[PDB]
């Protein structure tokens, strides 16, 4: 359906599956995985050459054409913010006789550039904020789609229009050059880029078509971590709450409960960047109950206390609408429910999951969903409250509402350590 380049994964290699059989050469510096993700690094032999099949279609100039792909771009270095912000580098180049298009990146900005035969250039970009508490784009997989017409060169992010550029002074742009996937610029040794599902179409993609392709390429049977990678079993995870973004979970001292504290922030003296720390709070690990975590799986939510693996439980018969979760050494207790069913209540793409507590795997009784609540803590005349790691029945009715509330305190995201994130 109007697709002229379809770079996908097959047999430890990238291949064009558009049906026009272009030649693809992946050099030894490009890392591949079966999840269709490939990585461009700063090593010289980290490149991909696409020699487009010149013997099948018009293949000289396209009036209308689009380019879609998913990208994951590492966080700036805390001590190398200058080179990050100033130095720009090309990631994908496609030109012949000094005319064509190129995708470049300068720091927190990705850039689409056109150049016609006469040398006239035009650009359109997307920029994500780097003063954010919790950024949705930094080091996280997101969906880029670039649409080119006679009038406008638009940039869509995650199915939504983000940028527009008037390109009527632009003439014919030579399109049939080699497509070189390589980092090109004055970059750091530690610079890299992840990409997946790269595609080129000989048409202007409607916003509807783009949002649709976004939803489709977002869909999976499995759940995903904070960065957007598949959620794994036996993998160490920090925990993030979409309801309380600046809040993390800590085992309260000399207690079996999880208190909720405020994330430490960037405390160096640069004004151009800011963030909340992600690698804080307890280290969690998900266990299977009888690899990759899938929807409706039954799991054990464990975490590491000291030199020991502990488990998150709930009390079976609490009378209020909510209750503090009980964090303990692993054990079989007829006093606790220990099995969580992992859930996805959102109909839209998200990296958030929910954690349901049920009586039995066979039974239909829903005990509640794991979240965060503000419990009474102390004081008579002046009542003081505290936020605790909890289970709540209130969430049950709430996840039914449409559209699904992202701000709900039962929406969790798991954060593994990533080379694309340093703090």
């Amino acid at each position, epitope marked *: 359906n109007n697709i002229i380049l379809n770079l996908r994964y097959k047999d430890n290699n990238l291949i064009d599956l558009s049906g026009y059989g272009a030649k693809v050469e992946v050099y030894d510096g490009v890392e591949l995985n079966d999840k269709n993700q490939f990585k461009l690094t700063s090593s010289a032999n980290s490149k991909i050459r696409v020699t487009q099949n010149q013997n099948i279609i018009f293949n000289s100039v396209f009036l209308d054409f689009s380019v879609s792909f998913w990208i994951r771009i590492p966080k700036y270095k805390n001590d190398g913010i200058q080179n990050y912000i100033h130095n720009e580098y090309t990631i994908i180049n496609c030109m012949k006789n000094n005319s064509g298009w190129k995708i470049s990146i300068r720091g927190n900005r990705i850039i689409w550039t056109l150049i016609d035969i006469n040398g006239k250039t035009k650009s359109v970009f997307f920029e994500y904020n780097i003063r954010e508490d919790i950024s949705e784009y930094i080091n996280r997989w997101f969906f880029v789609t670039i649409t080119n017409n006679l009038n406008n060169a638009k940039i869509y992010i995650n199915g939504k229009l983000e940028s527009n550029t008037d390109i009527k002074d632009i003439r014919e742009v030579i399109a049939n050059g080699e497509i070189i996937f390589k980092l090109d610029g004055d970059i750091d040794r530690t610079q890299f880029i992840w990409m997946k599902y790269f595609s080129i179409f000989n048409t202007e993609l409607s916003q509807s078509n783009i949002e649709e392709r976004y939803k489709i390429q977002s869909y999976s049977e499995y759940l995903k971590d904070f960065w957007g990678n598949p959620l794994m079993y036996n993998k160490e995870y920090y925990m993030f709450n979409a309801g309380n973004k600046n809040s993390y979970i800590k085992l309260k001292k000399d207690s079996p409960v999880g208190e909720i504290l405020t994330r430490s922030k960037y405390n160096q003296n640069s004004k151009y960047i800011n963030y909340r720390d992600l690698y804080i709070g307890e280290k969690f690990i998900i266990r299977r109950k009888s690899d990759i975590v899938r929807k409706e799986d039954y799991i054990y939510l464990d975490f590491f206390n000291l030199n020991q693996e502990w488990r998150v439980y709930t009390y079976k018969y609490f009378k209020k609408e909510e209750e503090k979760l009980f964090l303990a050494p692993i054990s079989d207790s007829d*006093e606790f429910y220990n099995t969580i069913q992992i859930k996805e209540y959102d109909e839209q793409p998200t990296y958030s999951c929910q954690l349901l507590f049920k009586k039995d795997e066979e039974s239909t009784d829903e005990i509640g969903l794991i979240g965060i609540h503000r419990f009474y803590e102390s004081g008579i005349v002046f009542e003081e409250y505290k936020d605790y790691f909890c289970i709540s029945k209130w969430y049950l009715k709430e996840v039914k509402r449409k559209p699904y509330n992202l701000k709900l305190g039962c929406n969790w995201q798991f954060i593994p350590k990533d080379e694309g994130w340093t703090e």
Partner: nanobody
Amino acid sequence: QVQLVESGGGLVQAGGSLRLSCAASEFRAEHFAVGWFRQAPGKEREGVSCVDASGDSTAYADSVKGRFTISRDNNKNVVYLQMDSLEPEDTGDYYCGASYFTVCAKSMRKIEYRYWGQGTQVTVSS
């Protein structure tokens, strides 16, 4: 600070009765479950009995049924422990604590309970 003042108890001969009282200092105790523990000198302190956030649900140690009866007055912010047929093996300092949870459990694990008071000594003589 935020504590749970205990009272009652003292010297009493074997077979008699006694009544302990927990009052909540600087917090409302109806939100929490509440438990009485005993501590003999040297030994670790064990759970004696406990009660739900409300009344209704109760739990006692197996060596305590059915001589003791725990109860709650949430209006007066006070927990009572009636003790009958006391044995000399009930001697020791009695501490009262509030739980993090609303749920009382026969387990009566020390870590679940906080806001401990200074306690009141009881002694039973043959």
